[PDB]
Design a protein around this ligand. Structure first.
Ligand SMILES: Cc1ncc(C[n+]2csc(CCOP(=O)(O)OP(=O)(O)O)c2C)c(N)n1
Ligand SMILES: Cc1ncc(C[n+]2csc(CCOP(=O)(O)OP(=O)(O)O)c2C)c(N)n1
Ligand SMILES: O=C[C@H](O)[C@H](O)COP(=O)(O)O
Ligand SMILES: O=C[C@H](O)[C@H](O)COP(=O)(O)O
Ligand SMILES: [Ca+2]
Ligand SMILES: [Ca+2]
Lengths: 675, 675
C-alpha cells in the first residue's frame, strides 16, 4: 500500500541522512516512522504557512530522533529539501543534529536536551486553551488545535517531565496528546538496568488518559484510533504507549548500538531490499508517497482557507476582539501600551523592586491581554499576581477558568521555564512570565538556556536577589547566578535599582521578540534615585551622577546603586570626586553604540564596580571589582551587608584604594580591547 | 504522659525560636512534632558522636522546618543548646534559617532548596547498602542502619525527587523510610490549586511500599507501627503518609499563613495554656522530657559501645577487611594510592581526555575501594565504568549486586548530583563520581551548588566539554557552563589538557575532603604536551613553556593548550616570542602562594587567555581574552573551530594584536589589585 511505502520512505530517508553524515541517531526514527506517518496524517498544518495560528503543533521531545522530523518536513513540502537532508549534521545546514526552531522550518521548539519538549508541549497546550477561552465564540472556533508530542524513555526519566506532567494533568489539558516510544532501550542498554517503574500507572496518578498500542511497529490503524480516542477525552491529557522496536528492520534492531550511530552499509542494503527499495539508491522519494502527502496538504490548505474566512466573519461579528486578535497575529503590542508603566520621582517612598514589579504588572496586565504568567508556589513572596485577576484553571475545579491569566505552577521551576518556552512558541504575541527566587532560577537552567538559544521572549520574575533577603540564609542567597546567565548568549539580565529602572526593565521584557529576560528583584526596600528615568535606564547602562572632574567612576546595579551614591558622599569628605553609573542590563548596554558606551565608561578615569555577588563579567565595565565571591549568611540583611563591608564606608575605602592604585598610570576605558 | 509533654515541648521550642527571631517557619514544625518524636525514639544515634558509622540517619528535606530539627537536637543533648535556639536566624549562630551540615551538629546534609534532602537520603541509603555488602559478614552486622527522611508537598513537586524516587524504587532500597507531611498546604495555599496528583499511586508505581497514618497530629502509636512495618519490607523503600494539620494547635492552623511567618503573641499564649505550659515562659524544657530523652540516648550509647566491640572482633576475624574499614573510618586513602595514576610522555599517542579518564578509573578503582560512581545513561560516551566491575543493583534483579561499584543512574542528572551528596554524607571516606555531558551538569545545578556549600568531595565526570564534540550541535555545546561553576564558591573545575593533567585532576578529586570537583573532559583526541607532569599540574596553573624574553604569555586550558603551543610556533615566524601557561584548575591555582602565582603570571608582559567558551572570569589571569561568547554549531568539530578562528593562525593574530595594543604601556600582572 501507499501507507506502507510512505513508512519505508521515511525510515530510509532517516537512515540515509545519518549515513551521509556518518553521525546521528537512526534507531528511534526507524521505530517511530509508523507513528509519525499516522500522526502527521491526522494533523492540520500548512507547509507554506508555518505560523497559521490554528495549526496542530508537533513536538519531537526525543530530539536526537530529528532525522525522522526532517524526513516528515521534506516529504510534506516544507522549506526543507532532500538536498538539505544530504547535509544533515553539516556545518551551516538547515538540518542540524538536534532541531532548532530558529533554523528549521516546522520545528516549533528546540529539543535535544531530554525532557524539554514534552514540557514545551504542555506550554503550547496551555496557551491554546487560554487563547481559545479568550477568543472563541458560538459558531467561531477560532482556536481548536491539538498538541502532539513524541517522547522516549529518556524524557520520562528527566524530572522536568514529571513536573510538567503532574501540572498538565491537574490542568485537564485535553488537547495534549503525547506518545511514549516504549522501546525499552536507552544509551546504557535495557531500561531494566535503571528504569523499571510502571510508567502507565504513574501517568494515571497524574490524571492522564492512557491508550496502549501493543504493535506500534506496524499497526497504524491502532495509532490513528488512539488519536481519535484521545480527542474524545476532553478533560485529560493523553499518553499513547507505542510499543516499538528501536531500529525496527535493522539487523541490529532492539539494541543500544542502533540508538546513536550510523548503521552498517550492508544493513542499509538489506533494509532497502526487504522494503522493495533499490539498495543502490539513497534518498529515494517515491512519487506515490509525494502524491499521497500532497493530497493531505491540499486538504489542510482548504481548512486554513476556511479558517481565514471564519476569522474575517469573526471580525465583523466581534469587532473589538477581532481587532485585538489581528494585532496579536501581526506581532504588535497595543499602541502606547507603555504609557501605563509607572513613573517615580526622588520624592517618592522607598519600595522593594519585587513590590515595584507587582505595581507594574497591576498596571500593564489590564492593558496588554497577551500577558499571562505565574509563580512556582511563591505568589505572595514574588508578588506576581495582579489583584482581581482570575487563575488559569479548568472551570471544573471551581478555582479559575481557562480564560484566566495567572498560573499556579507549584514547586516546579524547571517545568515552569520549559512551559514558558511553549507558551512563547504558541505565538499570538504571548508575553509570558514566571516567578521564583533568583537562586532557584538555577533549578531551571536546562530550560532557561533553551529560551536563549530558541530566541523566546519569556520573562523570569526573580525576586530575593541577594544577601538582602536576610534570614533564609546562604542556601537562598545568589552568588554565581547572574554571572551564569549573563555568560549565556542572548539573556537580558535586568537588576533594576528603583521604580523608574523597574519600569524600563518591564518595557524591555514585554517589547522583546527574540531575547529572554531575567528580572533580578529585591526583597528589601530601595530608595528612588536622583537621576533615574525610564528613558535613561532603557539604554541598559547610563550615567546616574555625572562628575566632570571625576577621580573615579563607580558602576553598580540594583541595590548597590544607592550604596554607590552614599559612598560618593563619604568620598567627597575624603577629597575624592566620584561619578556613578547604573548598569541595569549589561546585554542592553552592550548593544548600544560604541560612542554611547564610551560616554558612560570613558577613558582616563579608574572605574570600580559594586554588586553584592560574583565579580565575574565585571571587568568588561571596570578596572577593579568589589563583589561577593563567597557564600552568604543567615541573619538580618543589614547585618550581612555590614559583615561583608557593603557599606558606604566600605565602598569608599575600596574607591580610595582604587584611585591610589592608578596614581601615575594611564587608564583607558574597560570597553577598549586589542581585538 | 511524658510523650505528650515531649511533643508539646518540641512544638513550643520551635514556635518560641521563630518568635525570638521574628522570622521563620512555625507551621510544619507544629505539624511534624509527633512524627519527629516517634522517629527519633526509634533512631539509633549518639549526640556525643555524630559520626558513628552505624547510626541511623535523619534528613529534613523540608528544610524550612528546621526549628523542628534544632529542637530535637537540643532536647537530645547534641552540641546545640537552648541558648543557640534563642539565636535562631541570627548572624553567626549555630541555628541558621535552613540547616547547614558544616555548621549544625546532627545536620547530615544542607537543605532548604526543596527536593534535595529526599534525594540525599536516597544516596545515604545507597551508600549504606553498598557499605554493608562490602563489609558485613556472618555474625558481623557492621552496617545495618536506616535512613529516615521527612519531606513535604514542595519536595514532592520538585522533579529531582521524582528522579530519585524512581531510582530508589528500582534499587529496592529497603532501609530508606520517608515520611510525607500530607498537610495539603503550600505557600500559594491549598494544594488543590496546583498539586492534585495521587501521590500514593505514583509511589506505588515506582515500587515503594506505602503506610498511611490518617491521624498523624496525635497517633504516635501508629507512626511507630509504620516504622516497624517499613522495617519488615526489606526490598522496597517505604513512604509513610502522615496526614497532619499545618500549624497544629495554632488559631491559624490549616492555613498558608502559618507556613512561613511568626505566630501572633496571643496565639502562642493559647498554645501554651492548652498544652499545660506557662504562657509567660519561653524556651521551656521540662525535666521529665530531658530525662526520657536521656534514657534513649543512654541506650543508644550502649548500642554503640557494643558496636565498637563488634568492630574489634571483626578486625580479629577479618584482618584485611578490618584494616581497610579502619583506614576508611580514619578518613585516610590507601598509602601511596596515587602511584596507580597513569603517567605519559610527549612520545605517547594523542588521547581524548574522556578516554584518559576511563584509563585513570581503570587503574584506581581496584586500588581504592571507597571509589564508587556512575553515569546518567552515558556510560559508553563518558567512559565511566572500569571493565570487569559489577553494577550496583539488588541481586534479585540478576543485573548486579549491592557490593557493586558502578551505578546506572538513568537520565537523571539532578538526582545523580543530590545522590552523590548523600553518598558523600554517609562518610566512610566515600569518593564518588557521576558522569554526564558537561552541558547537562547544568540540569543538576541545584545539587551542584549544595555540594559546594556542604563541602562534599563529589566528582562530576563531565565529558563532551565544548564545540569539540561536533555534530550534536549547540544544544549540547557548553558556553556558559565553566563560568557558572567557577563563579560558585568552593568548586574545583579541572579542564585537563592531556594525560598527565588528567591524572593530576583525579589526584585532586580523590584526595579532596571539602571541595567538589567538576572534570571537564573532551570527546576529541588531544596530544600529550611537552612540559606537562602530574607535579606541575597539581598546582592548578603552571608554566608549560617558559620564555625569558616573552613578548606575550598565552594562558589556556584543556583542548586550547595544544592550540596555544601551535600558535607559539606561528608567532615565532612573525618575530613574536610567546610563553604558554596551562591553567587546568583555577581554584587550585588561586590557593597557591602569591609568589608562585606571580611566577606563572608575572608583571611586565601582556597575557592573552584562550578557552573555547565564555570569557567570564578570565580577566583574573589575563589582560585580553579570546573566547567563545555565542552559541555553537552542528558540524564536524574541526570545521567549527575553524569557523570561530580557534586555529593557530587565529590565536596568533590576536596575540600579535595584543602585543601591539600594549606597545608603550606599562603592564602589571592580572593578579595585582587595588584591594
Ligand atoms: C538532558 C540530557 N541528558 C543526557 C542526554 C544524552 N542522551 C541522548 S539520548 C539519551 C537517552 C536515549 O534514550 P531514549 O530517550 O529512550 O532514546 P532511544 O534509546 O529510544 O533512542 C541520552 C542519555 C541528553 N540529550 N539530554
Ligand atoms: C527549590 C525551591 N523552590 C522554592 C522554594 C521556596 N519555598 C519554600 S517552602 C515552599 C513550599 C511550601 O510547601 P511545603 O513544602 O508543602 O511546606 P509546608 O507548607 O508544609 O510548610 C516554597 C515554594 C524553596 N525553598 N526551594
Ligand atoms: O543521543 C545522541 C548520541 O547517541 C549521544 O549524544 C552520544 O554521543 P556520542 O556519539 O558523542 O557518544
Ligand atoms: O519557606 C520559607 C519562607 O516562607 C519563604 O522563603 C518565603 O520567604 P519570604 O518571607 O521572604 O516571603
Ligand atoms: Ca528508549
Ligand atoms: Ca505542605
Amino acid at each position: 500500500s501507499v501507507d506502507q511505502k510512505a513508512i519505508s520512505t521515511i525510515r530510509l530517508l532517516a537512515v540515509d541522512a545519518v549515513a551521509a553524515a556518518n553521525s546521528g541517531h537512526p534507531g528511534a526514527p526507524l521505530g517511530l516512522a509508523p507513528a509519525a506517518h499516522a500522526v502527521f496524517k491526522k494533523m492540520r498544518f500548512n507547509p507554506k504557512d508555518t505560523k497559521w495560528i490554528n495549526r496542530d503543533r508537533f513536538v519531537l521531545s526525543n530530539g536526537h530522533a530529528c532525522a525522522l522530523l526532517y524526513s516528515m518536513l521534506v516529504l510534506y513540502g516544507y522549506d526543507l529539501t532532500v538536498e538539505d537532508l544530504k547535509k544533515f549534521r553539516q556545518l551551516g545546514s538547515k538540518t542540524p543534529g538536534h532541531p532548532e526552531n530558529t533554523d528549521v522550518p516546522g520545528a516549533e521548539v528546540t529539543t535535544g536536551p531530554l525532557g524539554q519538549g514534552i514540557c514545551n508541549g504542555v506550554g503550547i497546550a496551555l496557551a491554546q486553551a487560554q487563547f481559545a477561552a479568550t477568543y472563541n465564540k458560538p459558531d467561531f472556533p477560532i482556536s481548536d488545535s491539538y498538541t502532539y508530542v513524541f517522547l522516549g524513555d529518556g524524557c520520562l526519566m528527566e524530572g522536568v517531565s514529571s513536573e510538567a506532567s503532574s501540572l498538565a494533568g491537574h490542568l485537564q489539558l485535553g488537547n495534549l496528546i503525547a506518545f511514549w516510544d516504549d522501546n525499552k532501550i536507552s544509551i546504557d542498554g535495557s531500561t531494566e538496568v535503571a528504569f523499571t517503574e510502571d510508567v502507565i500507572a504513574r501517568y494515571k496518578s497524574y490524571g492522564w488518559h492512557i491508550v496502549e498500542v501493543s504493535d506500534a511497529d506496524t499497526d497504524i490503524t491502532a495509532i490513528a484510533a488512539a488519536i481519535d480516542e484521545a480527542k474524545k477525552v476532553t478533560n485529560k491529557p493523553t499518553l499513547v504507549r507505542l510499543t516499538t522496536t528501536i531500529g525496527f528492520g535493522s539487523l541490529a534492531q532492539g539494541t543500544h548500538g542502533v540508538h546513536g550511530a550510523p548503521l552498517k552499509a550492508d544493513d542499509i542494503k538489506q533494509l532497502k531490499t526487504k522494503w522493495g527499495f533499490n539498495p543502490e539508491e539513497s534518498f529515494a522519494v517515491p512519487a506515490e508517497v509525494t502524491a499521497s502527502y500532497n493530497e493531505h496538504v491540499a486538504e489542510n490548505q482548504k481548512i486554513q482557507q476556511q479558517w481565514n474566512e471564519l476569522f474575517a466573519a469573526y471580525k465583523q461579528k466581534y469587532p473589538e476582539l477581532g481587532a485585538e486578535l489581528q494585532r496579536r497575529l501581526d506581532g504588535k503590542l497595543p499602541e502606547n501600551w507603555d504609557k501605563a508603566l509607572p513613573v517615580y520621582t526622588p520624592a517618592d517612598a522607598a519600595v522593594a523592586t519585587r513590590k515595584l514589579s507587582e505595581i507594574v504588572l497591576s498596571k500593564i496586565i489590564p492593558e496588554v491581554p497577551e500577558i499571562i504568567g505565574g509563580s512556582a508556589d511563591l505568589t505572595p513572596s514574588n508578588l506576581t499576581k495582579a489583584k482581581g485577576t482570575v487563575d488559569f484553571q479548568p472551570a471544573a475545579t471551581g478555582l479559575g477558568d481557562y480564560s484566566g491569566r495567572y498560573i499556579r505552577y507549584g514547586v516546579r521551576e524547571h517545568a515552569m521555564g520549559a512551559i514558558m518556552n511553549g507558551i512563547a512558541a504558541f505565538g499570538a504575541n504571548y508575553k509570558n512570565y514566571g516567578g521564583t527566587f533568583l537562586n532557584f532560577v538555577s533549578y531551571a537552567a536546562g530550560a532557561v538556556r533553551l529560551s536563549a538559544l530558541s530566541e523566546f521572549p519569556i520573562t523570569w520574575v526573580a525576586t530575593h536577589d541577594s544577601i538582602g533577603l536576610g534570614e533564609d540564609g546562604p542556601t537562598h542567597q545568589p552568588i554565581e547566578t547572574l554571572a551564569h546567565f549573563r555568560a549565556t548568549p542572548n539573556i537580558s539580565v535586568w537588576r533594576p535599582a528603583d521604580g523608574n529602572e523597574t519600569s524600563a526593565a518591564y518595557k524591555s521584557a514585554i517589547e522583546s521578540t527574540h531575547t529572554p529576560h531575567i528580572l533580578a528583584l529585591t526583597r528589601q526596600n530601595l530608595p528612588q534615585l536622583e537621576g533615574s528615568s525610564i528613558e535613561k535606564a532603557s539604554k541598559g547602562g547610563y550615567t546616574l551622577v555625572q562628575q566632570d572632574k571625576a577621580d573615579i567612576i563607580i558602576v553598580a546595579t540594583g541595590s548597590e546603586v544607592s550604596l554607590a551614591v552614599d559612598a560618593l558622599k563619604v568620598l567627597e569628605g575624603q577629597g575624592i570626586k566620584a561619578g556613578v553609573v547604573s548598569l541595569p542590563d549589561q546585554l542592553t548596554f552592550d548593544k548600544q553604540s560604541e560612542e554611547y558606551k564610551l560616554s558612560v565608561l570613558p577613558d582616563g578615569v579608574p572605574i570600580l564596580s559594586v554588586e553584592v555577588m560574583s565579580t565575574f563579567g565585571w571587568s568588561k565595565y571596570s578596572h577593579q571589582q568589589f563583589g561577593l565571591n563567597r557564600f552568604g549568611a543567615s541573619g538580618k540583611a543589614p547585618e550581612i551587608f555590614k559583615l561583608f563591608e557593603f557599606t558606604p564606608e566600605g565602598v569608599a575605602e575600596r574607591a580610595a584604594k582604587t584611585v591610589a592604585f592608578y596614581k601615575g598610570k594611564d587608564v583607558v576605558s574597560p570597553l577598549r580591547s586589542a581585538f
